[PDB]
Design a binder for this molecule. Structure first.
Ligand SMILES: Nc1ncnc2c1ncn2[C@@H]1O[C@H](CSCC[C@H](N)C(=O)O)[C@@H](O)[C@H]1O
Ligand SMILES: Nc1ncnc2c1ncn2[C@@H]1O[C@H](CSCC[C@H](N)C(=O)O)[C@@H](O)[C@H]1O
Ligand SMILES: [Mg+2]
Ligand SMILES: [Mg+2]
Lengths: 248, 248
C-alpha cells in the first residue's frame, strides 16, 4: 500500500529471488520449491540470501520495532553469505531515511572455518566446513559489495568486518546494537558473537538465532543464557530460526 | 529517496534483472553485458522484459507525466513477451495508489505470426516468426500471469488481450489511453495498433514505438503519421526506441 511497504516487500522477494525462482544446490535435507524458499529451507544457486521469507519478515519486524520504539544502535549480522539479509537491512534504513545507524556485515568471507582441536565436539561432529563448495558458501568481500551496489545500497552506512568472529568481534568498532543477527550455524560462531557482541545489544534490542534447530548452536545459546541469567522469551520464527527481545 | 523512488527503481532493476544478470540468448547481433541490458539490446534467458533500462525509464516518464498532468486513460502495451514492462507499469500505478486505471496486456501469447501472402513485403523479408524458438518468444498467457503474481501485482487492474492485434484491437474493451506502447517489431503489428488503438490515446498521452530502427516499423509509423497529419516531435530514447506526445 505505502511506497515503503512496496519497496520492502519487493526487496524481500528480490533478495530471496521469489521473482525468478532460482534452483537450489543439492545438500543436507535436499529445483525451486515455493514452501522451501518461504521458510529458508533451501540453498539457492543464485539468490542473495538463504534465510527465506519468514526470517526476512522477522528481520524487518526487529528493525522496524527498534526504530519505532527509539531503541538505539546499529544492526549487525554475523554470517552474511552473499549479503541479502544485510542488503535488505540497509534497505529498511534507506526506506525510512535513517542516516544515523549502520549495517555491519561480518564474515570470514571464506565460508566455514576448518575444524581445530579447540572446536566444541558438536562443531567437530558436523564439520560445516565440508559443505562450503557444495553450497557456494565462500563469498568474497568484493562479491558481497558488488551485490549491495546492484540494489543501489552500497554506501558509507554499510561497514564490513572481514575475519573470524573470535578475531573481529571483541574489538569491532560499533558502540551499540539494536539488532544482532547470528547466522554462524556452529557452537563456536554463536558463542563467539554472544560473548563479544551481545553486551552491546541495547535494552529493547533483538537477538536472532538463525539456526536454533542445529544442536551445537542451541547448546551455545543456553550455555550463554544460563551464564548471564537471561530469561527473555525465545520466540520461534519458522522451522529453525528464533529470536528474543532483550529487557534490562 | 522516498519509498516510491526506491520501489520503482528496484522494480526496474528487477524486471530487467540487473540484480542477478542472467545470460542472453544467442541471436541476431549477439553472456551478460551491462551496457546491453542498459539499452535493451540483448535477449534475456530469464529476465521478464527485453526492453532494457532506458526504455523502462521512458515508460516511467510517460506514465508519471500522465498522472501528474491529469491525462485520462489506461496504459496498453501491444507485445509484452514475459510481461516485464506491463508489470512495471502496473507497479507504477500501485506506487501512486491509483485504482481508476488499468494496464492492458496485449499479445498473441504465441510469439510472432507465421507469414501470409497478406503480409507487407518487409514483414515477409524478415520473417520474425523464425526467431521464436531461438529467443523463447512464445510465452503463454498463464506464464505471464504467474510473473505478475510473483511481484504481487496480478489483480483486477491488469486485463489481458490474447490474440493477434488485427483481431483483438478494433473491438478491445478500453475507452481511453494515456500511454500506448507499441512493441510488435513489424509493419503489421505497428499498423494494426496505430490504426485501431491510437485514436483512443487521450490528448496529452504518449505513443511509444519500441522498434523504430526496424525499417518495416518505421515505414508504418510514417505512413500512419502522414495519413493523419500528425506532426508531434519524434523523440529518441536509445538505439531503437522513440516516442511522441500527442497534442490535440
Ligand atoms: N567463526 C566464523 N567467523 C566469521 N564468519 C563465519 C564463521 N563461521 C561461519 N561464518 C560465515 O557465516 C556465513 C553462514 S550462512 C549466512 C547466511 C546469510 N545470513 C543469508 O542471509 O543468506 C558464511 O558466510 C560463513 O563464511
Ligand atoms: N501481430 C501480432 N499480434 C499480437 N501479438 C504479436 C504480434 N506480433 C508479435 N506479437 C508478440 O509481440 C511480442 C514482441 S516482443 C515484446 C517485448 C516486451 N515488450 C518486453 O518488455 O520485453 C512477442 O511477445 C509476440 O508474441
Ligand atoms: Mg543459518
Ligand atoms: Mg521490440
Amino acid at each position: 500500500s505505502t511506497g515503503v511497504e512496496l519497496y520492502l516487500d519487493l526487496l524481500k522477494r528480490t533478495v530471496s529471488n521469489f521473482i525468478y525462482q532460482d534452483a537450489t544446490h543439492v545438500a543436507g535435507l535436499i529445483a525451486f520449491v515455493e514452501e522451501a524458499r518461504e521458510s529458508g529451507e533451501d540453498y539457492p544457486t543464485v539468490a542473495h540470501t538463504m534465510i527465506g521469507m519468514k526470517r526476512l519478515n522477522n528481520l524487518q519486524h526487529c528493525v522496524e520495532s527498534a526504530l519505532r520504539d527509539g531503541v538505539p544502535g546499529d544492526v549487525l549480522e554475523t554470517g552474511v553469505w552473499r549479503g541479502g539479509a544485510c542488503i535488505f537491512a540497509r534497505g529498511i534504513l534507506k526506506a525510512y531515511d535513517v542516516r544515523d545507524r549502520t549495517v555491519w556485515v561480518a564474515d570470514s568471507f571464506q565460508g566455514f572455518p576448518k575444524i581445530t582441536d579447540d572446536d566444541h565436539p558438536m562443531d567437530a561432529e558436523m564439520n560445516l566446513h565440508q559443505y562450503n563448495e557444495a553450497v557456494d558458501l565462500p563469498t568474497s568481500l568484493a562479491t558481497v559489495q558488488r551485490n549491495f551496489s546492484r540494489y543501489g545500497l552500497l554506501d558509507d552506512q554499510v561497514r564490513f568486518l572481514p575475519g573470524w568472529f573470535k578475531d573481529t568481534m571483541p574489538t569491532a568498532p560499533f558502540e551499540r546494537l539494536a539488532v544482532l543477527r547470528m547466522d554462524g550455524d556452529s557452537y563456536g560462531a554463536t558463542m563467539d558473537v554472544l560473548t563479544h557482541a551481545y553486551p552491546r545489544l541495547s535494552p529493547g534490542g533483538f537477538a536472532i538465532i538463525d539456526d536454533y534447530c542445529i544442536p551445537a548452536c542451541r547448546e551455545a545459546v543456553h550455555e550463554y543464557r544460563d551464564r548471564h541469567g537471561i530469561s527473555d522469551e525465545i520466540v520461534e520464527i519458522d522451522r529453525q530460526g528464533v529470536y528474543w527481545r532483550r529487557s534490562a
